[PDB]
Amino acid sequence: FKSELLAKFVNILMVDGKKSTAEKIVYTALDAFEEALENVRPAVEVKSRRVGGSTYQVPVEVRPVRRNALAMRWLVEAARSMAQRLAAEMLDASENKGTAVKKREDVHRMADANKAFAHY
RNA sequence: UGAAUACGUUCCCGGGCCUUGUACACACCGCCCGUCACACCAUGGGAGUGGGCUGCAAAAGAAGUAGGUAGUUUAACCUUC
Structure with a gap:
């Protein structure tokens, strides 16, 4: 597909050096992204300080x-056959459902709850 | 075969430099304080008790000395003895 984000996604999927197994999985379930990613991409996150x-x-x-x-990681971690689990997530991810979308939500939820610490 | 991640230095650990405080120098795992417990010693208080010394007020009154004297007695002087 000739895309660096796609490269990333597989390497984030890759386990134990096994790029081929990963590459197959992603390429096959893609046959069945750039949208479903953009509906998991989180704008805001909580960190932690010794205050x-x-x-x-x-x-x-x-x-x-x-x-x-963070999106890729969340897709894969939710998603985790695999091609029969990696389109599963990465379509509900275009239909604001699942667990990768739940992440974007429950992260923003935590941030919303901590706006009182936003800039201090 | 073959990744992910590093904003950053607040935080944790180890270390370096300068400075500062220190009652530390076995060097903070340092030093060090008081009670209570135990041992011992000296010392204060204490119903008191027994000794030493001494103040004051009296009593007492040996010897001596001085004063006064009925009484007693008496070589040196005197004498009508």
């Missing part, structure tokens, strides 16, 4: 690169 003497979950922006990377 002085406690641990507070502080909202921060996700930068666009980590945005695509």
Whole structure:
């Protein structure tokens, strides 16, 4: 397909050096992305600081690169045959359903709940 | 065969430099404080008790000395003895 994000996705899917097994899986279930990714990409995430003497979950922006990377990770981790689990997720991911979308949600939820720490 | 991730240095651990405080120098796993317990010693208080010394107020009154004297007695002087 000749796309660096696709390269990433398989390497994020790849296990134990096995690029072929991965590459097949992704390529086959793709036969059955750029959208379904963009509906998992999180804009906001909580981090954590030693604030002085406690641990507070502080909202921060996700930068666009980590945005695509966190999405891929979430798809794969939810998704985890595999091609009969990697289109399964990565279609519900275009239909704002599943667990990769639940991530985007439950992350934004946590950030929304921590807006009181946004900039301090 | 063949990744992911590193914003960053707050945090944890180990280490380096400068500075500062220190009652530390076996060097913080340092030093060190008081009670209570135990041993011992000296010391204060204490119903008191027994000794030493001593103040004051009296009693007492040996010897001596001085004063006064009925009484007693008496070589040196005097004498009508």
